[PDB]
């Protein structure tokens, strides 16, 4: 069963309720999805991972403006924290515009 995987679907039964891994990709579907309030949760807890999958989300919602999408992206930084989203927020600089800028410029004081 792996040494670096002993859980899975213990006691859960959702998707995004507690997988640290299978909701991994489900969370990256939903980047696709149509609808704007599913769109956000994912993005909301996309960067709780920490990982390359999340970097991008924010590059793209942050110019979204799709409020829950957008919003939920800024966030997702601060929750990182580092040099890895370090240059996410140097992506969206070069871009800022409105309140997508001062989550940039205002993260980074951060790392």
Same mark, same amino acid.
Do not use: H, M
């Given at each position: 069963m792996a040494d670096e995987n002993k859980w899975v679907r213990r006691d859960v039964s959702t998707a995004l309720s507690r997988m640290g891994d299978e909701a991994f990709e489900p969370l990256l579907e939903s980047l696709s999805n149509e609808d704007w309030r599913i769109r956000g949760?994912?993005?909301? $807890?996309?960067?709780?991972?920490? &990982?390359?999958?999340? @970097?991008?989300?924010? $590059?793209?919602?942050?110019?979204? &403006?799709?409020?829950? @999408?957008?919003?939920?992206?800024?966030r997702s930084l601060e929750q990182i924290g580092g040099e890895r989203v370090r240059a996410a927020m140097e992506k969206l600089a070069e871009t800022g515009t409105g309140f997508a800028r001062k989550v940039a410029v205002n993260y980074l004081e951060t790392h």
């Open positions: 949760a994912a993005a909301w $807890i996309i960067g709780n991972f920490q &990982d390359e999958r999340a @970097v991008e989300p924010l $590059i793209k919602l942050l110019e979204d &403006d799709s409020g829950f @999408v957008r919003s939920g992206a800024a």
